[PDB]
Swiss-Prot record, chains A, B:
Pfam families: Cation_ATPase (PF13246), Cation_ATPase_C (PF00689), Cation_ATPase_N (PF00690), E1-E2_ATPase (PF00122), Hydrolase (PF00702). Skeletal muscle (at protein level). Skeletal muscle, fast twitch muscle (type II) fibers. This is Sarcoplasmic/endoplasmic reticulum calcium ATPase 1. It is a multi-pass membrane protein. Keywords: ATP-binding, Calcium, Calcium transport, Disulfide bond, Endoplasmic reticulum, Ion transport, Magnesium, Membrane, Metal-binding, Nucleotide-binding, Phosphoprotein, Sarcoplasmic reticulum, Translocase, Transmembrane, Transmembrane helix, Transport. It comes from Oryctolagus cuniculus. Its cofactor is Mg(2+). Key regulator of striated muscle performance by acting as the major Ca(2+) ATPase responsible for the reuptake of cytosolic Ca(2+) into the sarcoplasmic reticulum. Catalyzes the hydrolysis of ATP coupled with the translocation of calcium from the cytosol to the sarcoplasmic reticulum lumen. Contributes to calcium sequestration involved in muscular excitation/contraction. The gene is ATP2A1.
Amino acid sequence: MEAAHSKSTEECLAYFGVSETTGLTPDQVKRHLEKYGHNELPAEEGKSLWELVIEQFEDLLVRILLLAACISFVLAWFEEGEETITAFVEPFVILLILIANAIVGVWQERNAENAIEALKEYEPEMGKVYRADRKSVQRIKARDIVPGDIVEVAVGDKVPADIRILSIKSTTLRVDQSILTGESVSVIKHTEPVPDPRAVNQDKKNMLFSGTNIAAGKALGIVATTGVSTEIGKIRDQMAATEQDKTPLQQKLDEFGEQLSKVISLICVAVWLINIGHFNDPVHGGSWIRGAIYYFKIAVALAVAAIPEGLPAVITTCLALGTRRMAKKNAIVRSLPSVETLGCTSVICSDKTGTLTTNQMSVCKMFIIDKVDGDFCSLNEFSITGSTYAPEGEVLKNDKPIRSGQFDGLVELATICALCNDSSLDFNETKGVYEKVGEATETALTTLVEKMNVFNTEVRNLSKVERANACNSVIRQLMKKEFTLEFSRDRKSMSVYCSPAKSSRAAVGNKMFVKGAPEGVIDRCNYVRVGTTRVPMTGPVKEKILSVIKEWGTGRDTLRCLALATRDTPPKREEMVLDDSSRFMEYETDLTFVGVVGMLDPPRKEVMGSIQLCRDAGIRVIMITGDNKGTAIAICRRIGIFGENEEVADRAYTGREFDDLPLAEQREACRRACCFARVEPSHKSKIVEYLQSYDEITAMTGDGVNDAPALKKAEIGIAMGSGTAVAKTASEMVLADDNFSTIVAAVEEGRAIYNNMKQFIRYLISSNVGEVVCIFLTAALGLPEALIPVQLLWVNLVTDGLPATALGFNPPDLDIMDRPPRSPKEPLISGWLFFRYMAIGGYVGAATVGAAAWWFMYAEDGPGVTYHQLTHFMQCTEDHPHFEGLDCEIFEAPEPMTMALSVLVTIEMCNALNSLSENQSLMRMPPWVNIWLLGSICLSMSLHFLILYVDPLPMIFKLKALDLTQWLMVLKISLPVIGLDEILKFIARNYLEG
Amino acid sequence: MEAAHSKSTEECLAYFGVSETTGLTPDQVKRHLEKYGHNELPAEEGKSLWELVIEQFEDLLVRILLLAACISFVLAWFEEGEETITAFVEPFVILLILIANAIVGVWQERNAENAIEALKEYEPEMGKVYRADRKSVQRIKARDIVPGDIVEVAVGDKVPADIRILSIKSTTLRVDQSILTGESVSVIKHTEPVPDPRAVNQDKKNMLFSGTNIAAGKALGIVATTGVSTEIGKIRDQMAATEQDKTPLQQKLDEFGEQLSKVISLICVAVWLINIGHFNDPVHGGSWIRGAIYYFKIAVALAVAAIPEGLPAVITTCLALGTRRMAKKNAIVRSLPSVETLGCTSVICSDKTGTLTTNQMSVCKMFIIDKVDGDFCSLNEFSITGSTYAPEGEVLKNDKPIRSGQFDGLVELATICALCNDSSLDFNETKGVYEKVGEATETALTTLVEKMNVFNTEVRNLSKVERANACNSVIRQLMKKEFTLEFSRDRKSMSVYCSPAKSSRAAVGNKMFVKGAPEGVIDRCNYVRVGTTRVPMTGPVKEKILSVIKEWGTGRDTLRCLALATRDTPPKREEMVLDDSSRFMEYETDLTFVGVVGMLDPPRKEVMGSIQLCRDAGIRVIMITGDNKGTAIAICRRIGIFGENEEVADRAYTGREFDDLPLAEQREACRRACCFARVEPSHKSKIVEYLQSYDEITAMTGDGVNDAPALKKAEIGIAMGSGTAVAKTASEMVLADDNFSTIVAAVEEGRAIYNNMKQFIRYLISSNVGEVVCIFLTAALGLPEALIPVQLLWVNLVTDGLPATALGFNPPDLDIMDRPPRSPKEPLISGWLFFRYMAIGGYVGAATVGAAAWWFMYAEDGPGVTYHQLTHFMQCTEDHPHFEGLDCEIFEAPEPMTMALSVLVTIEMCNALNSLSENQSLMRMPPWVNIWLLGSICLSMSLHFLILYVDPLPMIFKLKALDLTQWLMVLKISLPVIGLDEILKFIARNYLEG
Ligand SMILES: [Ca+2]
Ligand SMILES: [Ca+2]
Ligand SMILES: [Ca+2]
Ligand SMILES: [Ca+2]
Ligand code: NA
Ligand code: NA
């Protein structure tokens, strides 16, 4: 259904044979999902610069190599000597091991795409539509919204698909189409036919357009077009394929991959040029062409092993999987590139109400006069858990929960905080939260009595709809409120003339319960209560209570202390004036003290951790608050941003003081601020700009229309769930919680994937470094080349493949969020790490030929033992009076080859353990942190073992099984990759950081 | 232990710490078997001329082909188009299907060597040696006789290993060393030290030498040397490796294999030259080098399939396995080449006593006067089964067995043939046969009474040692022999004065039982017996009995008729002269008739079949007999060599009449003779020579010393078991039975393997013929080449491999021994068969592209249907207004390729059924004759099916699964290989033979 604008509210609906007040059937939803695809853009090709120069380069290596194996193969049939078996075997295995690589490489890749599919269950839904399944509007992915369904559209919403305006439901229907038509003034629409078919978006003021914003109103409609069929999609088609927007890492990796097109080809082509003096040896029949083919294999097969492969897909597995865990704890990050920015964001300019604080008012502590003797008193405090109007909370004592019932005062305390309350609690069947029924400061008195559950009403098996008011609606049936003296500036307090419920007696148990502010009330409290008795309010006692009330408003808490009181013997109502607020000061004097609570707007759950944890990781946090300069600061000292005692009157800000200062002060002050109180709605952008002009990376949260401007500008703009969709469009991350903490749970994750990437390669590079110098070293001095092409391929399958895959399945390093951030322009390899790269290589390659040389040279319980010169070994037949009871041929045997190639594989395995944590010890991050690695190891052990102790199998790779006595030398020479690397950690972690 | 001649009977034995009267231990027998190998020559290399030019030629084809697949493979990475999958797959499969050939080829070969091992259980043993296991001499293979054991050595024996003469056991010890030292006079040895170490065989007249003959005597000794350590072995070392003695077939096969180095390379190199106009087509990207590589694969991969492979080992499996069955029924043929001569031997100059006849005398029929009325009589005959002195025989009546007891006459008949008998039967515990105890003509009277078992003694559970004389030793206790009138020329008869055993009465039951020749006795028979009574011997009755006696000596039987008689009332012994032979004619007159038997020297078991069966197969048989001219002929008319009535007095021979005739008569007469009576011991050679000068192939049997000269000269000299080892050396086949029949059971087998060889290839050639023209035909006319290299390899694995293997596991054709012999110079392929070769090919190749062409052309229930021109198909894009609703690309689809290649495989399978019998119909030799073929078929069906209906698998070979409707067309086009070939049989079998 195209251009449904030419068509009115009847000819439209009937197109898909469907009535607005019903929608489309599930079978139909299928067909349109099948015939029009999804409501999204096409799949862009992720062909990297590494994929061209490295991945496929290998895919040439493996083939020309093989080609060569069939060159020499073919000439074998023309050899006059002995009909061989092992040479004949080679090309078979050549092919049969390279296929094993494909059993690995493609499998890693499939898990990659499986992981991306996994994410497709968390991708944020912002599209309310009417369907046939439910008799009510349903949530659904924007892409998944087929063209035909009655898309619902409200204040601030983002229109996912091209909707023909069917029925206008608000009084007006305007649409901010600044994204396309272009104007910061929205436009009035209507629901009628636009007869002329050829026109511009402007003149179609009877339809929503996919990607436009809702400035105001609410309507309904029908989807004309989706995906590429979209109007903006036809414009966005230009930006789709033709582009050049690689991220910084995506420029490193490949400048890091293309430099290896130099290294690899260079070194290995040189591994040919170095063996020029071995192109007419008798091992190759003294043939000047049959040799050069073989030393074509040595270089190339060493290359294959040298080339790190599987990276493109591994970072997919890593990145994606990390975005899964980000998504799981409500860090909703769409664009995967957003992690690379998410992980270096060193600043978090976030919001307060709903993000740093729960909004929901909550009573902290509250106390009763515990003992009164000698005009002196001890107080009885009771902290309440939780922070919400949901009664999900429990009273305390010294951080030890106890039943308020055990204290008679609290049983009066709640009676005042349940009766003396012109407000209530409610549960929401549609939403599922507890929302206040009145004013929050008074809602907190509903909250509290419920939590305490003084008289212990049975609520464990009582309904949500009864729980929100379980205790209160019991307290209410024990007493009566006869008339309320409303809260009065005069006395900074309220009161209620109560009385015993279900009564027969007239003036026998009426209790004028007061409530409100400290002094105002305490100045009218002449008696003190203890348990169920009374005693004259004393000097030092008064001063104890009021000093402790001074305490909470003094301390970092800053709990709004609210005194509560009782008049014992109330006066006659007939006598009492009922209609003049100023009479109440005579009607509220001479009270009996009961208690004084401390209540506040608490912080959001697990922020108090997510505030210190980030300061450690080199993150500069800022609140964008609405409270006044003073009171905003009190909230930022309540949490942790400011400390109890630490002068900061240079750092707090309000709009007055912000537009005053000269441009530079507005910049200079901004690189050192924490709190933006009463901040005008345009300030947010100017801040960002300034913060950015300090190379600092922003993390703005948002919600109401006028946040997009900042969010779009910042690097990771965030949005609120209850915040509109205009903002979830302009953002990079959507806090599906609203919380500051969930942003942290995101930066901390997005960082983790960065540390796993820097290891997955650290293993490959360092390990494969040694492998090539493992031919240089021996070829330099004269030592034998204790390898053959297949053995060089063997090292590639064993080491580069599966343990590599397990390095991308790693937990978080201990020091995930203590270390400073990466400034995005800092390269992929650092000097000390670059040494650490070649250092680790230096050794794992030196151990390899070592183990081979140890056999010929200083052998234990073995044949030969020639500790003297092994360099000019090719002159052994020239001068034979040097050896002592051993043939010159001995060095062509598979015994040393076994050892070294066994040490080559053995040592790179524990090199992954090293690579488990970039900086934390094997004691600190043991091998069992990663079970997926400890599996990868044993596997290859089975495999590598398997090709030693299966008759024909070793014969294939030219090896020999080893006695117990010999597999011990493997440990003494392989373990040192632990001690070696572990020493590296000690230098970086202590001297280079910390 | 070398040169044990320098050492006497003490210093010798002690060498191996062993005492002559004990020998060597089983553990020692191990060690010497291990340290000195076997007592035989080395293993000669069977490297054929086909192995050089065909087997290994293929082993080059498969490699340069593969090489090519990695040439084009490598350039794929440099192709600008689309990243393919199926081309990338190819080289993998290339290697992976050629390996499948090796799963076949080598497996056929292993069964080959397993079969040869199987024969090593039947190889004839001629070496009696003293060992520790048994306290007596043991039989053992000559090769298996280690050096050390006390080798026993008798009259005529062949000394297997170098024996030091320890203890001379005969009165003299001579040794015929004509084979080495050289002299037809043997040499006296002794048992003492030959002090001078350097000397010639002659001067060591104290030792046996391996390969020399025993002229006379018997001794014992100790083995100095074995195998190459032998003296003749050191001389035979010259004849071992360096030689040139290929058999006629072995010259055909390879002149037949090297001609295919022309055919194969030629045709297939031409299959490249014909596609020169396809080296710049868009299918190959218009590239002038990328194409030529592919049409290198078409030719070569067609070659591979063309080359018949597995033949060298199959003929091993066939030949060997046939030699197994030859060995099983006692045709002991050593040299495997001896079959190739065994199968064309069209003459069988064999022996009589022990070979054509059982030697053992045997009574045929025998009769009683059944009725006597009116001077006339009817006779009651009783044929006896078997032919041996072993009582393994049963009486008959009209070829219906009945108990002689039911006839009273026979109960007297045996009484005369048990009592009147100066001879007996015996069993041999050491040998296990029944050997006579007296003269055979009289032994037959022991034999007979036992067989009859008249009075029915319980013998079913009586010992062998009691059975040989079970009845007789019962008859003997019913009567008494008082004195024997010995057999007398006078009366041509013997008699015994009997009497009732355990008697008290004197002249009351004495019975003078006579025995002997017809007339002599019957002329003294005045009474006749019937049942238990008497009646005067009559004229016509007498003449009935004597005419019937005239009958058996007249008929081809020629049974020595021997009349038996009884004197009822004997005269007084006191009166009777006891000491004058001439008195017995008065003492034997007036007898009572009882019966007259017919007895003879019967033929050997299953000769009467093996005489007619061979005359059919074009075999000219001759007896070398000792009987006189007349009586020798009677034996050769008794069997079948001569017919009842057929004048042959021109064809029978005796030595008198043989050395008389002039050389040419001795030649001219010899190409037409059957019986050589009283033949001087040198005649045998002169015969051979003459028979050979008629291009005829001899099959001389032998036994006594002076047979080797003939046997060595003849083509398949044979030997007797009981015949000495001098003869088992000079022979080519050893009759482990002695029988003429077992020679037949050998020629008939040795022939069978010849017919199986001529089919195993008939399948390959004919089938693979069509395959190559299957590219010529279509390339000639312009049709598409409905194949690709892998498909050409597929045909080679499916068809050439396993069904081929099953063609060598075939039963005997109905017409195994009716058809004439192959004269050894007649080639491997005959004109009509050569047509039949290309005829069958002509069609099985024409069916293949047919089925492909039927798809494009005249299709049923299929897409396309272009019955018009398909030749200039490459001009379809040039001129596109010709097609009707189909793309020009349609012809590159896998649909026709599937069909044809499916017909290519389908039709060659039933081509093996054809090949089951060279000339006998599917009705005559149904497919279920060979279960090993009917297995081979289903297998490949599973395989071929499997690569159509397994998603990726067909995609690999570029094929498509077929609907039921389509696998029906396969039958209608494949079955005709039956009807086609079956018509060939009808022409050859009837018009060209029969
Ligand atoms: Ca690699
Ligand atoms: Ca590696
Ligand atoms: Ca073949
Ligand atoms: Ca074939
Ligand atoms: Na942004
Ligand atoms: Na011979």
